From Swiss-Prot, chain B:
It is found in: Cytoplasm. Its main location: cytoplasm. SUPFAM superfamilies: Winged helix' DNA-binding domain. This is Small ribosomal subunit protein eS10A. It comes from Saccharomyces cerevisiae (strain ATCC 204508 / S288c) (Baker's yeast). One of its GO terms (molecular function) is RNA binding.
Swiss-Prot record, chain C:
Present with 146000 molecules/cell in log phase SD medium. The lineage of its organism: Eukaryota, Fungi, Dikarya, Ascomycota, Saccharomycotina. The modification Phosphoserine is found at S95, S127, S219. It comes from Saccharomyces cerevisiae (strain ATCC 204508 / S288c) (Baker's yeast). InterPro entries: KH_dom-like_a/b (IPR015946), KH_dom_type_2 (IPR004044), KH_sf_prok-type (IPR009019), Ribosomal_S3_C_sf (IPR036419), Ribosomal_uS3_C (IPR001351), Ribosomal_uS3_CS (IPR018280), Ribosomal_uS3_euk/arc (IPR005703). Ubiquitinated at Lys-210 in response to stalled ribosomes. Ubiquitination leads to activation of the No-Go Decay (NGD) pathway and degradation of non-functional 18S rRNA: first monoubiquitinated at Lys-210 by MAG2, followed by formation of 'Lys-63'-linked polyubiquitin chains on monoubiquitin by HEL2 and RSP5. This is Small ribosomal subunit protein uS3. Keywords: Cytoplasm, Isopeptide bond, Methylation, Phosphoprotein, Ribonucleoprotein, Ribosomal protein, RNA-binding, Ubl conjugation. PROSITE patterns: KH_TYPE_2 (PS50823), RIBOSOMAL_S3 (PS00548). There is a cross-link at K104, K130, K139, K149, K198, K210 (Glycyl lysine isopeptide (Lys-Gly) (interchain with G-Cter in ubiquitin)). Its main location: cytoplasm. Residues 19-90 form the KH type-2 domain.
From Swiss-Prot, chain D:
This is Small ribosomal subunit protein uS10. GO terms for cellular component: cytoplasm; cytosol; cytosolic small ribosomal subunit. Pfam families: Ribosomal_S10 (PF00338). GO terms for biological process: cytoplasmic translation; maturation of SSU-rRNA from tricistronic rRNA transcript (SSU-rRNA, 5.8S rRNA, LSU-rRNA).
From Swiss-Prot, chain E:
The lineage of its organism: Eukaryota, Fungi, Dikarya, Ascomycota, Saccharomycotina. Component of the ribosome, a large ribonucleoprotein complex responsible for the synthesis of proteins in the cell. The small ribosomal subunit (SSU) binds messenger RNAs (mRNAs) and translates the encoded message by selecting cognate aminoacyl-transfer RNA (tRNA) molecules. The large subunit (LSU) contains the ribosomal catalytic site termed the peptidyl transferase center (PTC), which catalyzes the formation of peptide bonds, thereby polymerizing the amino acids delivered by tRNAs into a polypeptide chain. It comes from Saccharomyces cerevisiae (strain ATCC 204508 / S288c) (Baker's yeast). Present with 30900 molecules/cell in log phase SD medium. This is Small ribosomal subunit protein eS17A. Component of the small ribosomal subunit (SSU). Mature yeast ribosomes consist of a small (40S) and a large (60S) subunit. The 40S small subunit contains 1 molecule of ribosomal RNA (18S rRNA) and 33 different proteins (encoded by 57 genes). The large 60S subunit contains 3 rRNA molecules (25S, 5.8S and 5S rRNA) and 46 different proteins (encoded by 81 genes). It is found in: Cytoplasm. Belongs to the eukaryotic ribosomal protein eS17 family.
Length: 57, 96, 223, 107, 67
RNA sequence: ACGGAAGGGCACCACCAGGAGUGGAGCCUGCGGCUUAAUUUGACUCAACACGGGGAAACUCACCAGGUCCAGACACAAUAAGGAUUGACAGAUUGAGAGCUCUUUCUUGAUUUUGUGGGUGGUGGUGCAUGGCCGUUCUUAGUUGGUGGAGUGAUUUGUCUGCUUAAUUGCGAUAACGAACGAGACCUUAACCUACUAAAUAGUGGUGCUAGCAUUUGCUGGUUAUCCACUUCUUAGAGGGACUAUCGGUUUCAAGCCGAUGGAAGUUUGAGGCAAUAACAGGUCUGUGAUGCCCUUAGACGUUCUGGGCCGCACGCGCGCUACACUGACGGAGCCAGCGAGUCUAACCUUGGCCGAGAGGUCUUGGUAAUCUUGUGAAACUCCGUCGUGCUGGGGAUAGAGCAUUGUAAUUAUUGCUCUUCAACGAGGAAUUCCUAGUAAGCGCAAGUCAUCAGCUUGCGUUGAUUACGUCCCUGCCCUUUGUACACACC
């Protein structure tokens, strides 16, 4: 920034401050899916999901 | 990375269950606390998960803190093939 | 366990260090302003001084759950041994850290350097602070780096009152051109004080006596 | 009906002397408030954990050293008492920063 | 060097100016007086003030002083 | 802002008056130079050179000779379920029990491969792009604003000739008056407390219990609780205490300064911590997952593994260590500190008992600690001898041989031990550093570093002088006056 425009800065800055306070005032009072994971793997822990038979000589 | 799909499943499942992972910045660590894999497998699989916008990664003090994201709940839902409204630490505990 | 008390106390300090670091990283855009840890029976309690507890909660307590789980698994805690509480901080405009974060996100949202610092000092002063200052050191659009002081009101710089009153914070904001540092100073009103000395060692108030109506010949009174 | 004397020692240990003397003096006072037998707050020679360091991140400059310190104050109070009142006194009077340790013991 | 600071001599000034119907050429009672009249955050400061207002008290007893 | 212009001050990083030295010697150690496959590098007046906590066997590590690995997220595309891709026994090969590579041919299943974009790591570059941090100016005393006076104004007075302080510290003069940052206050530590609160994790007195010598009562110990009592010593909480007090010299009888007395203490009580505004292209991208830009990214400047090197030696320079002896070496013997620190998912501090000349081994033990190591029985030092001024028995370099300890590893010899070898140095040129009281210097610890290694440093206590209490001559820096064509400010 430069000094030739100084006032302007302050003003907007000051305005900003005010704005903040309004926000600070706004906030001063302003205005399921169960199943789980281990229990879902344990709820689906019923079999019919594997296959193995080998060993030859 | 290049890892058998079993360890990848250990990872993705575990993350899906906890929603939160941690891992120290030290590869060559043989085995990770809890998860049944190489530490590096976890760190890198996680890096993959985040760099496609499914999880979030943080550091500080030589430790990786991994958060799971909602889109990541979609993709991990697909990858674990479980039905919609499935799991994750998104149920307010017992009563605590 | 079974440690020596020296090593335990130092360890506790380090625990706080890693804690504050981690939260400061994780709770940036949520007005995190500091933590405190309390060793109780049953649990260990971690309190989060923020300005946006509505987010630190998250979707009906999802994110605070995440943070608790994080700290837990990392520091090796057994589920329930640790409990976290999101808590609003009173007067954001008297915490250094909160302001450093403020202007950091001002400049990160691309606001005028002068207007940012001046707006910050303005808000800090309007929150009834004794004095305030914002140093800005780095490079802005130029190439040869510079620095800027923006201070309003009263501050002291020497002695123990430093510890008692003024608040320092350094914050490294990094942008497309390089980085720049925010040094914030907040001198809180010694008057209000609450706990600790309510005035500068400098201070010496003289109590104003009374105009007497003397003279008058003796006499006595009976009861 | 519980209640029976067990020779107790409590150690308070902290760095914040204000809260420490706070909870210590409050403990002895609020204890003897109902006529126990005690040996009241015993002060162990305060500990100075020093650290000596070059202030510089690099090597340059006149060799300026700096000395940080953390101060450990440790107290202990001896109380002869039953079961309930101890559990009550360790449940409450809790202070963040002040570390309490409740031993029974006699050997 | 024992050149008393500005705040000291200023305070002493005010005090002699508004409590001459008290005090003396005795440090102890001036110190104690100071404690009963002036809110001072320091013992050391208060003793400096009291000692200087004491010396001034002695040197007013044999003539005037500026201020 | 600056002067190679004038007048003032301040200061042991300045003299004076002295002390202990360094500078000469041997070694220790950093820097240069040279040497080198490499001998990684930042830093070069105060403010570089026992500095990067920089005491490198691996590691560290950045260098050199060599060997693996991808930990190249992600997108599109290409390959391809007839197999995209992974691994490997022995052999050949390699320093290597690396399936690195090849011989041969089992395997594995879509996790990879190739290619593009896009990423990432990097002790690679840029401290002349930055943050932060630090050092310097500075052992400094400077900065500002309200009402008022002067000037159209930028601005000036306040903020000053003198005096006085360590101090823009005050007094005083006075168009200025009354303030605020900084100094001071404050904080921390060493000093005082037969005053308060106390304590088998501190200690005292008495009593039990018991040994020795006297014996007449006594003198000198033992007994982690045999009881009772206490708080002088020890410990740390709240207080008190000094405010240069009282008197008196001296000066504008102002600030103050000097001297006596008292006092735990009267040099800011001694020593520190903090410490405004402003500047430097001071140092740090070799602390950071602080960072812009550039460079590198698979025959890697990523990373890891083996070996070497930062220690290399005609020589120049800086910090040091040990000495030239008789206020001494040796050997007996006397024997006294304070700051510390110590083992959980581990082997740290270690008494004690044996074994050995020693170093050390071994068998147990206390201690997460005011409780055990430990009274840290440290060293100068004190005492009685031996030597007798002779490169001597001062001095311990260089070196051969043997034993141990740390460690996966000790050769270029980590350290420790024992025997022998017995250098230079006979007080040190020109020059030059530090210092004013429990300070100098002499003396040893503890801590950092640390598996092992202090000739280093940070602190600590032990013994304890001489000479000032001044000045502006050398130097360094502040301050006014003055000049200026500088203001990116004499680079």
């Amino acid at each position: 920034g430069d000094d030739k425009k100084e006032l302007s800065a302050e003003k907007e800055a000051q305005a900003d401050a005010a704005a903040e306070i309004a926000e600070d005032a706004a906030e001063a009072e302003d205005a399921a899916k169960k199943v789980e994971l281990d229990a879902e793997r344990i709820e689906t822990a019923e079999k019919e999901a594997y296959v193995p038979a080998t060993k030859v000589k | 990375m290049l890892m058998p799909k079993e360890d990848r499943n250990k990872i993705h499942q575990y993350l899906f269950q906890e929603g939160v992972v941690v891992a120290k910045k030290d590869f060559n660590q043989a085995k990770h606390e809890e998860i049944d894999t190489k530490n590096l497998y976890v760190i890198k699989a996680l890096q993959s998960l985040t760099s496609k916008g499914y999880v979030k990664t943080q550091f500080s003090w030589q430790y990786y803190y991994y958060t799971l994201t909602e889109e990541g709940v979609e993709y991990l839902r697909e990858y674990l093939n479980l039905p919609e409204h499935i799991v994750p630490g998104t149920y307010i505990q017992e009563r605590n | 366990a079974l440690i020596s008390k020296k090593r335990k106390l130092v360890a506790d300090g380090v625990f706080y260090a890693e804690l504050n670091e981690f939260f400061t990283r994780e709770l940036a855009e949520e007005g995190y302003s500091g933590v405190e840890v309390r060793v109780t029976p049953t649990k260990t309690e971690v309190i989060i001084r923020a300005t946006r507890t509505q987010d630190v909660l998250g979707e009906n307590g999802r994110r605070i759950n995440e943070l608790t789980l994080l700290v837990q698994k990392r520091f090796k805690y057994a589920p329930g041994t640790i409990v976290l509480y999101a808590e609003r901080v009173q007067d954001r405009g008297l915490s250094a850290v909160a302001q450093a974060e403020s202007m950091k996100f001002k400049l990160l949202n691309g606001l005028a350097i002068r207007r940012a610092a001046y707006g910050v000092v303005r808000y800090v002063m309007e929150s009834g602070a004794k004095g305030c200052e914002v140093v800005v050191s780095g490079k802005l659009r130029a190439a040869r780096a510079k620095a800027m002081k923006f201070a309003d009101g009263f501050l002291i710089h020497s002695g123990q009152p430093v510890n008692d009153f003024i608040d320092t914070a350094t914050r490294h904001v990094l942008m497309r051109q390089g980085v720049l540092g925010i040094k914030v100073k907040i001198m809180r009103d010694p008057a209000k004080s609450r706990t600790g000395p309510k005035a500068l060692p400098d201070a010496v108030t003289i109590i104003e006596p009374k105009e007497e109506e003397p003279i008058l010949a003796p006499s006595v009174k009976d009861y | 009906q519980q209640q029976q004397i067990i020779k107790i020692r409590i150690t308070l240990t902290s760095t914040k002397v204000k809260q420490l003397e706070n909870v210590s003096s409050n403990i002895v006072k609020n204890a003897e408030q109902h006529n126990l037998v005690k040996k009241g707050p015993v002060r162990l020679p305060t500990k100075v954990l020093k650290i000596s360091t070059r202030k510089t991140p690099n090597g340059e400059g006149s060799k300026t050293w700096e000395t940080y310190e953390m101060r450990i104050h440790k107290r202990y109070i001896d109380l002869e008492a039953p079961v309930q009142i101890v559990k009550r006194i360790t449940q409450i009077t809790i202070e963040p920063g002040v570390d309490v340790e409740v031993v029974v013991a006699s050997n | 060097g024992r050149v008393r600071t500005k705040t000291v001599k200023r305070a002493s000034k005010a005090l002699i100016e508004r409590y001459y119907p008290k005090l003396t050429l005795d440090f102890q009672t001036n110190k104690r007086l100071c404690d009963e009249i002036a809110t001072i955050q320091s013992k050391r400061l208060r003793n400096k003030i009291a000692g200087y207002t004491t010396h001034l008290m002695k040197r007013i007893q044999k003539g005037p002083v500026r201020g």
